[PDB]
């Protein structure tokens, strides 16, 4: 019966492939051949943030595009005032092995996690004057790779045990569990409307999940190796993914197939992070070779380079108002570019 | 100029001072990564000295602070989080000598660890434990069961030397690494001193690197 089931699955997959190909009327490049190229953009570093000892792994922008939070493997989670370069808070972590951080939309909480397999929530606006641990979520069975807030009371977490979770903060229980992946889940991104989310999980595939219903809706299997980053397109109808094979790809939820791939012959290093601009025309990708690249999401050509760091760029982020882009690195410095 | 941003600057400078003060203390402790086969003497080494994610443990010796991280609990592709321990000063290793079925997997994992891109210099440490159990077992059953190519005499010293060679020969780039070796015992606590000598040699090499000689 196992052979029969595998044959049925293969036939269904062939049917899916045929249906997807039937829709491939034209390529995005051919349609976009007429638009004017963005030319060349040369951004510059305006601020440098100093104070971390070890390599910095993650960072997140505030919803006001003024404050930001950075997490370093030396056991420190710092909050920076970007405009003036001051430091507001310096939370010491219980576990030094932090692999992610997040900033709540309202600015009242900050979440972190790592190899401890626990997601910790910190309250910033207490009456006592010191940041305290508000809640600890301890249901996973693997390292936490990413986490994002939906509101002040719900959080989505991705772990290396091949499953994702939706948690109710106040009660401290797993409200929902998402399963179906084969490898470890690395990256996570929430839709602008906040009803769906995607993830790529070290099996060369990305999945679309419904937050309220708790089932997998679509699967995309274009890449060749482990996907490390993911980010929604501003309108919420497409998303870009970077993998260890040194190439990026753009997928569309409604067409259900790969649209375009960004690669070059001189790049043989993987991508660690990706991000879009406010208008979505520029795709910024951090690479393993100590510099970040700025691609045209429509023309598939390299528009710019950022080469301020001296080690592996691990985290990249754009502000909500699109004024500046912040990049961290293993050299323990954060550069804000504009 | 600064209406009340002067107080914010004062607070930021105090935060900087505290961060630097803590960093000056964090750079004075030596980190060790503890690996080994499941159910092996991984915690046996820790238990012998006066010592689910990570099981970080700490102790002190000769005015030197030691951290040891047991990452065997993690069940995932090591390729994605193994780079976190690039700055450690040792890769302390354990292998059972009894069991006999845990051996092949052990060789594969040891070979993977040695030839890892990150641990191209970090001095590996090797601990053979369960020595009495192996001494009795080889006498009870020949060691050739899992060693078809075995041709030496069925004697404890011969077999021990054979397996030691079979373990140290996985290392390929012998110029950089400084793999040690030591036969652990059920009693007579010495292992801490053996890890002390290794770390004191690593410290000398680090000091030479800092100076510039090499």
């Amino acid at each position: 019966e196992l052979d029969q089931l595998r044959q049925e699955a293969e036939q269904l997959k062939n049917q899916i492939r045929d249906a997807r190909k039937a829709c491939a009327d034209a390529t995005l490049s051919q349609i976009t051949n007429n638009i004017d190229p963005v030319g060349r953009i040369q951004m510059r570093t305006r601020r440098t943030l100093r104070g971390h000892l070890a390599k910095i792994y993650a960072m997140h922008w505030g919803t006001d595009s003024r404050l930001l939070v950075s997490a370093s493997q030396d056991g420190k989670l710092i909050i920076w005032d970007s405009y003036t370069t001051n430091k507001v808070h310096a939370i010491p972590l219980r576990s030094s092995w932090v692999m992610t951080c997040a900033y709540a939309p309202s600015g009242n909480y900050v979440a972190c996690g790592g190899l401890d397999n626990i997601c910790s929530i910190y309250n910033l606006k207490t009456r006592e004057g010191n940041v305290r641990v508000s809640r600890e979520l301890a249901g996973h069975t693997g390292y936490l790779s990413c986490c994002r807030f939906l509101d002040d009371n719900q959080i989505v977490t991705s772990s290396g045990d091949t499953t994702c979770a939706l948690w109710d903060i106040e009660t401290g229980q797993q409200t929902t569990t998402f399963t179906g992946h084969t490898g470890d889940v690395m990256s996570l991104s929430l839709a602008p409307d906040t009803r769906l989310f995607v993830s790529g999980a070290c099996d060369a595939s990305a999945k679309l999940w419904d937050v309220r219903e708790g089932m997998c809706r679509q699967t995309f299997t274009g890449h060749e190796s482990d996907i490390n980053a993911i980010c929604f397109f501003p309108n919420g109808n497409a998303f870009a993914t970077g993998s260890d094979d040194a190439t990026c790809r753009l997928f569309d939820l409604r067409a259900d197939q790969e649209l375009m791939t960004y690669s070059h012959d001189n790049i043989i290093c993987g991508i660690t992070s990706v991000s879009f601009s406010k208008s979505g025309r520029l795709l910024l990708a951090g690479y393993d070779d100590f510099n970040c690249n700025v691609w045209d999401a429509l023309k598939a050509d390299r528009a710019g380079v950022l080469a301020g760091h001296d080690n592996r760029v691990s985290c990249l982020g754009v502000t909500d108002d699109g004024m500046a882009v912040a990049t961290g690195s293993w050299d323990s410095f954060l550069k804000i570019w504009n | 100029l600064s209406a009340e941003d002067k107080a914010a600057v004062e607070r930021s400078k105090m935060i900087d001072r505290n961060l630097r003060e803590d960093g000056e203390k964090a750079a004075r402790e030596v980190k060790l990564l503890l690996l080994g086969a499941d159910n092996s003497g991984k915690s046996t080494i820790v238990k012998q000295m006066k010592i689910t994610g990570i099981v970080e443990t700490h102790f002190t010796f000769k005015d030197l602070h030691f951290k040891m991280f047991d990452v065997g609990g993690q069940r995932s592709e090591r390729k994605k989080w193994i780079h976190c321990f690039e700055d450690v000063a040792a890769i302390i290793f354990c292998v059972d000598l009894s069991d006999y079925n845990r051996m092949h997997e052990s060789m594969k994992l040891f070979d993977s660890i040695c030839n890892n891109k990150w641990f191209t210099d970090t001095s590996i440490i090797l601990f053979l434990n369960k020595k009495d159990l192996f001494e009795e077992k080889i006498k009870k059953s020949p060691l050739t069961i899992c060693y078809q190519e075995y041709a030496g005499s069925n004697t404890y010293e011969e077999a021990a030397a054979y397996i030691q060679c079979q373990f140290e020969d996985l290392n390929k780039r012998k110029d950089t690494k400084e793999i040690y070796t030591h036969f652990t015992c059920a009693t007579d606590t010495k292992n801490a001193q053996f890890i002390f000598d290794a770390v004191t040699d690593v410290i000398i090499k680090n000091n030479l690197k800092d100076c510039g000689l090499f």
Partner: single-chain antibody
Amino acid sequence: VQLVESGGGLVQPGGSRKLSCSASGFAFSSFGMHWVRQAPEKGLEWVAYISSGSGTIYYADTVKGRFTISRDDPKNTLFLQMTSLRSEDTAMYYCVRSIYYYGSSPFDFWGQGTTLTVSSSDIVMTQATSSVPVTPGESVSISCRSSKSLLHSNGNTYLYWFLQRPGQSPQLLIYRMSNLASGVPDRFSGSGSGTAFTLTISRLEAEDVGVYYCMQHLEYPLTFGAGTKLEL
């Protein structure tokens, strides 16, 4: 969270005295401290300030030279040493806390007060409307004035509001002229451009009768106003 002060009493002119303010329930080491004065029937008047870490000990002109302010962090205490006391130093003294960082709300918590009696280029704030009859359920509006514009280049506006109820210590309502404090109802509001400000209360109810004070925090000699009083 609480602060209690002690050390007051009766002192002959030309003597010396020492007050004490003990804090509990919060992180003392992370807060700067302030001393404030209140004459028997006049408004408030800033006295002395000390910052976290003891790096800024600004004083007031009326007492600069014969006063001293110092703090003990491990013991969680604040001190004030006064020498050569005069007849003009008879008043009630309040201990206040303030924390300064982006988005903070300084002057949030005040003490209880301690009474002291002696036997026998600054910004000017005006509160000309010293009396206002009010009736429950009707809206009321208070006004304030300044000498020079309080707006700063960085978009801030340092004007504060405080309420003193009958026989009670003051409390914070609105910081920086637009932001509501923590715990106050949502019917309080405040607005106004540089050199003129106005507080607004909608659906006035009991527990709002008292004296309303203004305050500036743009420069060193912090200055209060005469105060406006509401009566039934």
